[PDB]
Design a protein around this ligand. Structure first.
Ligand code: MG
Length: 221
């Protein structure tokens, strides 16, 4: 039986991409760049802060200095911090709170496996701090997803080996990170984006303790 569940933040617990979008839209409007709409936000999914800023500058074929590029990326981060003050328990994805309650009552460890520098603050905004046993130590993460580092760190933070854990993710890079950590991946999303080899669920409402137990026992063959 598994002893821990390692949670990714964006796309599993909540939608932080929406707040990243509002941050980028605020920056674009300030510097006078049109086109940062909902359809453009899809080109920013799973893309780094630097490459995302470049895509926004590309919308106006705008060239900036290395110093101004750094300043704009900083200004976006400041915008993001202001945007996330609005995160509330209403932001929690369906089924996640009940899963957290069920894991805690069954003495199964809960860890946050996120590359977010605002992870604990977001859990606090969502009233989820009491369910989390530990957050992955950023000092033990040398490389990001697809590298297994973050999931290995999350498992270790709750006192378990990755092999005794289940990892929940919405991205292909994150699924690969769980696989290489030794933990069992259960993905969330469309089969067109994630692939056949692992167990995938359409949405987070399917992430029940009953289902996690079933999948775990099935993969012990
Ligand atoms: Mg994610």
């Amino acid at each position: 039986m598994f002893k821990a569940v390692l949670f990714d933040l964006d796309g599993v617990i909540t939608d932080t991409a929406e707040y990243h979008f509002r941050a980028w839209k605020a920056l674009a409007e300030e510097i006078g760049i049109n086109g940062v709409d909902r359809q453009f936000n899809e080109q920013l999914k799973g893309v780094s802060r630097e490459d995302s800023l470049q895509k926004i500058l590309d919308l106006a074929d705008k060239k900036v200095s290395a110093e101004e590029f750094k300043e704009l990326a900083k200004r976006k981060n400041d915008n993001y911090v202001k945007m996330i003050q609005d995160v509330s328990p209403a932001d929690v994805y369906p089924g996640i709170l009940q899963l957290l309650k069920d894991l805690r009552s069954n003495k199964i460890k809960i860890a946050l496996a996120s590359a977010s520098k605002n992870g604990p603050f977001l859990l606090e905004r969502m009233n989820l701090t009491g369910y989390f046993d530990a957050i992955a130590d950023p000092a033990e993460v040398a490389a990001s997803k697809p590298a297994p580092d973050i999931f290995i760190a999350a498992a270790h933070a709750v006192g378990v080996a990755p092999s005794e854990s289940i990892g929940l993710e919405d991205s292909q890079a994150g699924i690969q990170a769980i696989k290489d950590s030794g933990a069992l991946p259960i993905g969330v999303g469309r089969p067109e984006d994630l692939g056949d080899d692992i167990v995938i669920v359409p949405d987070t409402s399917h992430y029940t303790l009953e289902f996690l137990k079933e999948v775990w026992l099935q993969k012990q063959k």
